[PDB]
Amino acid sequence: GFAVGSPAYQFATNAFAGNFAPQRVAIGRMSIDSSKVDFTGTTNTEQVVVNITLNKVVKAVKINVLGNTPAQIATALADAVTADADLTGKATAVATGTYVTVTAVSPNVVSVGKGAGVYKIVNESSETVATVLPSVIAENHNWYFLATEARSDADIV
Amino acid sequence: YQDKVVDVEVSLGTQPIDTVGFETPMFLAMHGNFPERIRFYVSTAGMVADGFAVGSPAYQFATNAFAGNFAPQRVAIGRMSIDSSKVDFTGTTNTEQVVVNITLNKVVKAVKINVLGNTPAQIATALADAVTADADLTGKATAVATGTYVTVTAVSPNVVSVGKGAGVYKIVNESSETVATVLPSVIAENHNWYFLATEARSDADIVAAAEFAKANYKLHIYNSTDVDAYAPENSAASVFDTLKSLSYDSLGTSDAGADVDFTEGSVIGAMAANDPSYGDSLHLKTMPGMVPFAGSDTQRSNAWSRNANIYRGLYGGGSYIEGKTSSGQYVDVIRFSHWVKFRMEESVFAYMKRRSDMGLSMKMSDEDLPVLKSVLMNNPINIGIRNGGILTGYDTENKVSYDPTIIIPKRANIPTNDLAARILRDVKVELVYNNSLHYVKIRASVVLDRP
Amino acid sequence: AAAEFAKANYKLHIYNSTDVDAYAPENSAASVFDTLKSLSYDSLGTSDAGAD
Amino acid sequence: YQDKVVDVEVSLGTQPIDTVGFETPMFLAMHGNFPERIRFYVSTAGMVAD
Numbered sequence: 001g002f003a004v005g006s007p008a009y010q011f012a013t014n015a016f017a018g019n020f021a022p023q024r025v026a027i028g029r030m031s032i033d034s035s036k037v038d039f040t041g042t043t044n045t046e047q048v049v050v051n052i053t054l055n056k057v058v059k060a061v062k063i064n065v066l067g068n069t070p071a072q073i074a075t076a077l078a079d080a081v082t083a084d085a086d087l088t089g090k091a092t093a094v095a096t097g098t099y100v101t102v103t104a105v106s107p108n109v110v111s112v113g114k115g116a117g118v119y120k121i122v123n124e125s126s127e128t129v130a131t132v133l134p135s136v137i138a139e140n141h142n143w144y145f146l147a148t149e150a151r152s153d154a155d156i157v
Numbered sequence: 158y159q160d161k162v163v164d165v166e167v168s169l170g171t172q173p174i175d176t177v178g179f180e181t182p183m184f185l186a187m188h189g190n191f192p193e194r195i196r197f198y199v200s201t202a203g204m205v206a207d208g209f210a211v212g213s214p215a216y217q218f219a220t221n222a223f224a225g226n227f228a229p230q231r232v233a234i235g236r237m238s239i240d241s242s243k244v245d246f247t248g249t250t251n252t253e254q255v256v257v258n259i260t261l262n263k264v265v266k267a268v269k270i271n272v273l274g275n276t277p278a279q280i281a282t283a284l285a286d287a288v289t290a291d292a293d294l295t296g297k298a299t300a301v302a303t304g305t306y307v308t309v310t311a312v313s314p315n316v317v318s319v320g321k322g323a324g325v326y327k328i329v330n331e332s333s334e335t336v337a338t339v340l341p342s343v344i345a346e347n348h349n350w351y352f353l354a355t356e357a358r359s360d361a362d363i364v365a366a367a368e369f370a371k372a373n374y375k376l377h378i379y380n381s382t383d384v385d386a387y388a389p390e391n392s393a394a395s396v397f398d399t400l401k402s403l404s405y406d407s408l409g410t411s412d413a414g415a416d417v418d419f420t421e422g423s424v425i426g427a428m429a430a431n432d433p434s435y436g437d438s439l440h441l442k443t444m445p446g447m448v449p450f451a452g453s454d455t456q457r458s459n460a461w462s463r464n465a466n467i468y469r470g471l472y473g474g475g476s477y478i479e480g481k482t483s484s485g486q487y488v489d490v491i492r493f494s495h496w497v498k499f500r501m502e503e504s505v506f507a508y509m510k511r512r513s514d515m516g517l518s519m520k521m522s523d524e525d526l527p528v529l530k531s532v533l534m535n536n537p538i539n540i541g542i543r544n545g546g547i548l549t550g551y552d553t554e555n556k557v558s559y560d561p562t563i564i565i566p567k568r569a570n571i572p573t574n575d576l577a578a579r580i581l582r583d584v585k586v587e588l589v590y591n592n593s594l595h596y597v598k599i600r601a602s603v604v605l606d607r608p
Numbered sequence: 609a610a611a612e613f614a615k616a617n618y619k620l621h622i623y624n625s626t627d628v629d630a631y632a633p634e635n636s637a638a639s640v641f642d643t644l645k646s647l648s649y650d651s652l653g654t655s656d657a658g659a660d
Numbered sequence: 661y662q663d664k665v666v667d668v669e670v671s672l673g674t675q676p677i678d679t680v681g682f683e684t685p686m687f688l689a690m691h692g693n694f695p696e697r698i699r700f701y702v703s704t705a706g707m708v709a710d
Contacts (some may be wrong), residue, residue, distance in 0.1 A: 004341070005337060005339045013368055013369075013372050016372050017368070017371050017372050019671060020669070023662070023663055023664070023667070024663060046310070046359070046360075049335060051335070051337065051338055058338050060333070060334060060335045060338055062333075085265050101486065115335060115337070116359070116360065116361035116362075142661070153555075180654050200617070201616060201617075220613075220616050223616050224612070224615050259610075264619055274701050353693045389696050402678045442630075443648055445615065445647065445648040445649060446647060446648075447648075448646050448647065449646060453697075453699070453706065453709075454700045454701055454706060455699050458700055474648070475646070475648055485675065485676055486672065486674060486675060486676070487674075490674055491671060491672075494670045494672055497668045497670065498668050502666050502667075502668050505666045506665055506666045509665070510665075521644070580662070590674065
């Protein structure tokens with residue numbers, strides 16, 4: 001159920017595409033809270049597409065961008081997500097400023113990934129890398145390279 | 158105690174093994190003709206049976222693929238959910254009967270428009286009116302004219318396919334899905350194809366296809382009409398530049414009909430039936446269905462700088478120029494590498510299984526490990542040498558050796574823990590690929606005498 | 609279309625045409641013959657007055 | 661742990677490399693015939709076209 005273009009999928013594809021690609025890769029897990037789609041500072045001129053996978057169901061949201069400011073694109077994406085028949089009552093999207101925040105109504109599972117367009121995906125979490133790492137190594141210690149999705153400073157330190 | 162005066166054991170070491178084949182291509186079209194995700198066809202007559210409109214993208218690809226000199230034995234067609242068909246007259250000029258083929262529920266019709274000098278809007282309006290006034294399409298399909306283009310939509314559960322006839326225009330199909338989200342399902346259902354081609358024409362659809370093709374050992378082929386393909390040396394704005402920057406391995410070409418005839422099939426048709434063991438480049442092979450490139454000398458250099466292959470006419474005939482992927486390496490090298498990798502893997506595994514089915518399993522002793530040398534020397538390497546793919550021989554003057562070499566360690570050199578785990582690692586092999594000839598330069602001279 | 613179908617299915621296509629452009633100057637590149645030659649199709653064509 | 665009975669690595673050492681060529685000259689003329697800064701020609705017949 002990993003959404004195509006999602007961070008984990010991107011990492012796996014890049015790892016496997018190499019000349020000396022590893023035989024098999026491992027994926028961790030931290031509790032997700034919400035997915036943030038950011039258009040801040042970007043410019044778009046063609047169809048913006050965002051892949052959303054829900055309970056092993058794949059959908060692609062399409063937005064027809066004319067010159068539109070980022071706020072207009074964010075509002076259009078939120079409206080399109082909210083108007084989808086298979087997402088009402090399962091996921092929620094709220095536009096604000098230049099970014100749109102997407103949250104899943106439990107117990108449903110939602111994964112967000114990239115399509116055409118210029119933007120980035122940011123995910124929040126109720127946990128932190130420091131508090132999560134010990135459990136992972138405790139469960140299984142058969143890996144050598146450590147990479148993380150957390151991008152900000154202390155998560156790297 | 159024993160219960161038989163005579164007992165006989167019989168073991169069969171003839172178990173066949175599955176193998177991969179580098180022939181069958183795929184075209185990922187947009188339609189709703191059949192429910193499954195992949196269908197294989199051996200001729201266009203089969204496709205027309207399923208309801209593909211003549212001149213439709215899939216039909217064009219199939220015809221171009223089959224027309225080639227080395228046409229593949231059979232081609233596969235994908236499926237993405239279709240939404241609507243867009244017929245565009247924008248920027249075009251017409252002077253004769255414009256014809257559009259429409260197939261509905263396995264019923265074939267041809268809409269005819271008598272163009273007098275009429276602007277594109279008038280032609281679009283006339284086509285919409287003709288479609289709407291047809292008795293067999295009311296209540297089944299809908300056409301709305303607007304601007305310079307006409308959009309056609311099918312009333313469910315009816316199936317509509319649109320194809321080309323006489324006239325200058327193009328067909329564009331929308332879809333509620335995307336190539337990135339569709340490809341995994343196709344490969345999951347059936348993995349017996351090697352060439353990947355797509356109908357989606359716009360950028361990200363090509364980038365995702367290239368990434369997926371590289372990830373899963375498939376070869377991606379695409380065409381584009383982007384005028385920027387041969388822009389000045391500093392454009393860095395076409396799809397070709399983006400693909401080159403990422404070092405992906407995809408074969409691309411610049412053509413005018415790529416959005417009209419989908420000549421992708423023509424490129425595949427010239428090498429599909431030629432086994433990789435030959436290492437035969439695409440340099441000069443003729444490509445029925447493609448139109449020779451028309452442009453100045455500067456454009457031919459601009460296109461070559463980006464690895465955007467060009468089909469150029471020479472001495473009257475039309476000849477391809479070179480096969481270069483986005484990463485700069487020649488396509489035949491990539492094909493040969495995939496072939497050798499897979500048919501060493503399969504050969505070794507099959508030999509081990511066949512020995513193990515008769516007891517007498519392979520044993521890690523100096524008197525049995527060298528047997529692997531015979532197995533590899535057979536099948537891939539010998540087949541390559543006989544067909545000319547792999548160089549061989551010894552030069553007496555320069556004293557260089559070109560023969561393949563295989564290195565296998567002895568038991569005493571293997572670390573003890575490897576013996577305990579029964580794992581051999583350090584096998585090494587070396588090959589010398591046989592480069593075909595692309596260019597020649599000659600110096601002549603005329604003299605009256607010699608000292 | 610006839611030429612393409614004939615090449616696809618191992619048939620030989622034969623046609624005649626009265627186009628005066630068939631023997632236009634060397635740079636016309638406007639008759640059916642030029643288009644067929646550019647595509648490298650295998651069809652037999654001839655220029656005749658009574659073909660129509 | 662290992663997941664393949666047989667595994668094979670293949671590496672290609674045939675990467676081409678860009679090279680410089682000591683043939684093509686340049687002439688810096690005055691005109692406005694074409695917008696870009698450089699054009700290559702293989703014969704005078706091409707120049708007369710522009």
